[PDB]
Design a protein around this ligand. Structure first.
Ligand SMILES: *[C@@H]1O[C@H](CO)[C@@H](O[C@@H]2O[C@H](CO)[C@@H](O[C@@H]3O[C@H](CO[C@H]4O[C@H](CO)[C@@H](O)[C@H](O)[C@@H]4O)[C@@H](O)[C@H](O)[C@@H]3O)[C@H](O)[C@H]2NC(C)=O)[C@H](O)[C@H]1NC(C)=O
Ligand SMILES: CN(c1nc(-c2ccc(F)cc2)cs1)c1c(CCNC(=O)c2ccc3[nH]c(=O)oc3c2)nc2ccc(C3CCN(S(C)(=O)=O)CC3)nn12
Ligand SMILES: [Ca+2]
Ligand SMILES: [Zn+2]
Ligand SMILES: [Zn+2]
Length: 780
């Protein structure tokens, strides 16, 4: 019943046996002598000239003896003080082309150094405040920042780091949660969070174990000091090959904790940060003693950022809801609302655009921006509040706290850090910002593990690594397009559409692709049947199942001209002579549908001539749109496409419908579609997307780009009102573009939602294209 020889053992035991592992305290299950033998502090964590060559005294926190290296329990500065060696930080960056490991090491180990609440902008503090972290960043591979998941809270983000999955898929949807199946709640404080039932997916430590790669315990009882956590990792690395883990995690509650008290603005954040840097230097000094500093891959990574949030900036739901004791609220930098043991429609309405200075917005979770991927889990309440940065929402009525996090993950203040350092990482390399969902695959790559299915795009971060085992390959196209000729007469069509001889070579099976499909046809990766339709100004992939385009592709040059829709073509809808009446929409559906109207994917505002404009009124270019949404879409088409073309030296636009009625972020099947236009087989999209591509080199036009591409995309909610936009009663120039920015999207998001694969034909490497597809334009 003792921890003698068992401190931070990788075994777990009992009862009636008592434990000595990293989490024995959190279960109050340690042996009588744990704190004595395992949580030692005597003589601190640094050697002194005095202690060099001491006979081992087991009561010291760490040792300065000749045997200390054999056990890996030296003070981290032992060789510096007692062998005339240099601190790691004081050594010059030297490139590590190959892993340089002690005898018996079969792979380079991975150490994940996770820091809680470490905002990206903290890195600017410099080698003055943080020399060790600055060396890792400079010598190794780093990003300017790493995007967390939503909500930007510890437990969702740390588990996303571990699994490569969105909170909705791994299950840890918040620091606080209620699961209606368990009829139980998850809390930061308590033992409940230790129950495995909450934790889905497959975290790295499990992935590694299943594939015969031993893992260190990632979790550390809060009582264990950081120096001890580092020393434990170093002792573990000192173990024989058949006991030694290949993957380790250190975790620090800082600088988060100080961020809460001080805020990210505090000049007093420097001390916390300097502590962290010290811990890093201890780790690197430690590795250097053990001859592991050119062997181990080190990842320095945060879980989220920190914002200035004071208790005076608090919205109270009681000031909006007159029935506030009928609801439970997960409060703070977000809101999640639920009935206590109640009508969500009147709740939302009562929370919508009530006050000028309203610092939150209510959403049914399916209406939240799709980039957040925050809906598909029974643990996520139907009603959600997006709270403005710097604010809080509480249920009912100086501060102790001055900082917090949890906000929308595109907010600057929420951004966090990534540094990769070691033989497998690149030397002195800066990489673009990326999302934390991508890291799991990398960590698997760094350990030679086959990753479990996750939300990362494997390959999109190959550019971080000197050597990558994984080679991404484009998916095979499943459905082939038809390329139909003019194979129907006008008189054959009876659609119910009003619209006021010519030599017919019109549906130009030529020139179009070259000027309107710049990056290849989208591959359809599901089994369906569709037709490629050509026109002077646009090309489309028309679905015969959904009776509208899956994608509409067109290029608008810098100097493109914008025209209006004439009075005589306002209600013009024309039949296509390449597609049968049966596989066409009809106007009667819309004239019968009191709520639903129609718009066009290719805009009639950007036709290249009066003649070409008639093709924009084809029934095959038509899609169901609520009047409310047409305000948005029309403004996009008439004003904003032109503006983007003007700013970016031409744009290629790929627009289309999205069906996600079950809000799983994935292309609906026909069966999952829950709304059609009245009395028709024509489905109503939940969203409309556009992918706006151009040359990164803006001195080259979009259609004549010889190099990297620039992308911006959105997934607009197809809503019957504009209640989401509080200034929607004003001119569209005052609110539409802001709505679109809120609903910015990765191409990869659109791919999940459509089952299309974009950018198949380019001059760029496929891994670069994966990077392009993972890009998110944030407007922050
Ligand atoms: C983010 O990545 C997630 C993981 O790849 C994606 O979730 C997966 O989504 C698919 C399709 O909806 C599901 O596939 C079905 O799986 C069932 C049962 O097998 C799996 O069951 C559990 C579910 O928790 C899973 O964890 C196990 O690994 C099992 O393999 C099959 O019977 C069906 O035929 C079908 O294949 C996956 O279950 C699901 N996995 C997880 C872990 O969520 C998610 O779609 C991605 N999100 C986006 C937006 O792309
Ligand atoms: C989730 N988590 C931890 N994750 C890692 C980790 C993950 C991936 C990496 F690449 C590196 C490291 C290490 S520890 C975790 C924690 C962290 C504790 N924080 C807080 O309590 C906290 C900190 C700051 C906050 N600010 C704020 O507003 O709220 C804050 C909260 N604690 C625990 C406890 C238990 C677990 C479980 C994970 C799942 N396993 S399982 C079933 O897979 O074996 C069980 C343990 N987990 N955890
Ligand atoms: Ca779906
Ligand atoms: Zn955190
Ligand atoms: Zn915090």
């Amino acid at each position: 019943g003792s921890c003698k020889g068992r401190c931070f053992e990788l075994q777990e035991v009992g009862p009636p046996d008592c434990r000595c592992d990293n989490l024995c305290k959190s279960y109050s299950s340690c042996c009588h002598d744990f704190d004595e033998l395992c949580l030692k502090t005597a003589r601190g964590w640094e050697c002194t000239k005095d202690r060099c060559g001491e006979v081992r005294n087991e009561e010291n926190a760490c040792h300065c003896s000749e045997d200390c290296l054999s056990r890996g329990d030296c003070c981290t500065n032992y060789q510096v003080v007692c062998k005339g060696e240099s601190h790691w930080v004081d050594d010059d960056c030297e490139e590590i082309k190959v892993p340089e490991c002690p005898a018996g090491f079969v792979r380079p180990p991975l150490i994940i150094f996770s820091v809680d609440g470490f905002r990206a902008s903290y890195m600017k503090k410099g080698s003055k405040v943080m020399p060790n972290i600055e060396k890792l960043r400079s010598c190794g591979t780093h990003a300017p920042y790493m995007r967390p998941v939503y909500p930007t809270k510890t437990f969702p983000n740390l588990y996303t780091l571990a699994t490569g999955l969105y909170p909705e898929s791994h299950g840890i949807v918040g620091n606080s949660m209620y699961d209606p199946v368990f009829d139980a709640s998850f809390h930061l404080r308590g033992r409940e969070k230790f129950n495995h039932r909450w934790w889905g997916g497959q975290p790295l430590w499990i992935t590694a174990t299943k594939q015969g790669v031993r893992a260190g315990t990632f979790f550390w009882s809060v009582s264990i000091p950081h120096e001890r956590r580092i020393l434990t990792i170093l002792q573990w690395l000192s173990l024989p090959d058949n006991e030694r883990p290949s993957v380790y995690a250190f975790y620090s509650e800082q600088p988060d904790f100080s961020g809460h008290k001080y805020g990210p603005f505090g000049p007093e954040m420097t001390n916390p940060l300097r502590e962290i840097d010290k811990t890093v230097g201890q780790l690197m000094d430690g590795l250097k003693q053990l001859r592991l500093h050119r062997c181990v891959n080190v990842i320095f990574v945060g879980d989220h950022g920190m914002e200035d949030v004071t208790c005076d900036r608090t919205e109270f739901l009681s000031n909006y809801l007159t029935n506030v004791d009928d609801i439970t609220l997960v409060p703070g930098t977000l809101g999640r609302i639920r009935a206590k043991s109640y009508d969500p429609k009147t709740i939302i309405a009562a929370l919508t655009c009530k006050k000028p200075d309203q610092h939150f917005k209510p959403y049914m979770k399916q209406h939240l921006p799709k980039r957040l991927h925050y809906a598909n889990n029974r643990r996520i309440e139907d009603i959600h509040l997006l709270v403005d940065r710097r604010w809080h929402v509480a249920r009912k009525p100086k501060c102790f706290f001055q900082g917090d996090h949890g906000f929308d993950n595109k907010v600057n203040s929420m951004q966090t850090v990534f540094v990769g350092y070691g033989p497998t990482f690149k030397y002195r390399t800066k990489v673009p910002p990326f999302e934390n969902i991508e890291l799991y695959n990398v960590m698997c790559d760094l350990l030679g593990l086959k990753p479990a299915p996750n939300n990362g795009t494997h390959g999109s971060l190959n550019h971080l690594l000197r050597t990558n085992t994984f080679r991404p390959t484009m998916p095979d196209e499943v459905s082939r397009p038809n390329y139909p000729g003019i194979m129907y007469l006008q008189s054959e069509f009876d659609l119910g559409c009003t619209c006021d001889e010519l030599n017919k070579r019109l549906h130009t099976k030529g020139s179009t692709k070259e000027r309107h499909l710049l990056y290849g046809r989208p591959a359809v990766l599901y089994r369906t049947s569709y037709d490629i339709l050509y026109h002077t100004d646009f090309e489309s992939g028309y679905s015969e199942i959904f009776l509208m385009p899956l994608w509409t592709s067109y290029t608008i040059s810098k100097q493109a001209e914008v025209s209006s829709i004439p009075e005589h073509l306002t209600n013009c809808v024309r039949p296509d002579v390449r597609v049968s009446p049966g596989f066409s929409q009809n106007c009667l559906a819309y004239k019968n549908d009191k709520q639903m109207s129609y718009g066009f994917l290719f805009p009639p505002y950007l036709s290249s001539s009066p003649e070409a404009k008639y093709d924009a009124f084809l029934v095959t270019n038509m899609v169901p749109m609520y009047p409310a949404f047409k305000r948005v879409w029309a403004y996009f088409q008439r004003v904003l496409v032109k503006k983007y073309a003007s700013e970016r030296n031409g744009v290629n636009v790929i627009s289309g419908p999205i069906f996600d009625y079950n809000y799983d972020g994935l292309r609906d099947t026909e069966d999952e579609i829950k709304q059609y236009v009245e009395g028709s087989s024509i489905p109503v999209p939940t969203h409309y997307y556009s992918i706006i591509t151009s040359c990164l080199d803006f001195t080259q036009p979009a259609d004549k780009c010889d190099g990297p591409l620039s992308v911006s995309s959105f997934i607009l909610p197809h809503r019957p009102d504009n209640d989401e936009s509080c200034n929607s009663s004003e001119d569209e120039s005052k609110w539409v573009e802001e709505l679109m920015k809120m609903h910015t999207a990765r191409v990869r998001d659109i791919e999940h939602l459509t089952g299309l694969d974009f950018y198949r034909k380019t001059s760029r490497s496929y891994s670069e294209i994966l990077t392009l597809k993972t890009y998110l334009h944030t407007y922050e």
